[PDB]
Design an enzyme around this catalytic site. Sequence first.
Site, short mmCIF file in Angstrom:
data_model
loop_
_atom_site.label_atom_id
_atom_site.label_comp_id
_atom_site.label_asym_id
_atom_site.label_seq_id
_atom_site.Cartn_x
_atom_site.Cartn_y
_atom_site.Cartn_z
CB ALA A 176 42.65 38.71 38.98
CG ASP A 177 37.72 40.51 41.98
OD1 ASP A 177 37.83 40.71 40.88
OD2 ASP A 177 37.51 40.95 42.99
CB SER A 178 34.72 36.63 38.97
OG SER A 178 34.04 37.63 39.60
CG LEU A 179 34.80 43.79 38.64
CD1 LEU A 179 34.12 43.86 37.51
CD2 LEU A 179 34.55 44.91 39.70
CG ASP A 180 40.63 42.40 39.85
OD1 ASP A 180 40.19 43.67 39.85
OD2 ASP A 180 40.80 41.73 40.80
#
Lengths: 118, 77
Positions: free
Chosen positions: B34-38
């Site tokens: 994941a990234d921070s938007l996910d």
Amino acid sequence: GSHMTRLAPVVVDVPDDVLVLRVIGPLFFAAAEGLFTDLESRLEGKRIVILKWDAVPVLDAGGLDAFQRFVKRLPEGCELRVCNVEFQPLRTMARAGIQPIPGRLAFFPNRRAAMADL
Amino acid sequence: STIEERVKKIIGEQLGVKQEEVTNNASFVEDLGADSLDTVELVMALEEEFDTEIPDEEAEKITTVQAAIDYINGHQA
């Protein structure tokens, strides 16, 4: 205004046509208005402007409006790159459906990624 | 499904990983790609499913499967 939301210099080696700044402080409408107006005066000859937002803890509806207008007004050939968006501003922009715009607006997780094609 | 299963299902959907990988210990970023938007979208999806607004300070700490399960079970007010 106590000028507590401000642009800060970043020590990094970059081409002369690239500007790299940190935004420190919240992007509430009134503070955002002053900050983006200031930023617009620094764009001559810049192909890329990178804003690191690690120290922007909040972005409100009017602050976002101001951001969108700033992006809309960017000169042709000048791309805004924003990195290190914190949880509240990121959730705010997600709910608003903010999207990148080719050649105009791009987002990155960090400074390394924002500068990778440099 | 149980609440724990429902939380894991949503994590899998939002992050686009197989249910098999959504183990309690798993960190969204370090383990599930994941990234921070996910992560933000995942928190938003939990808010909608469980009909609850999660404060930013607490949402920021939801970074693993167990953390999500624990917040949902523990914050029903």
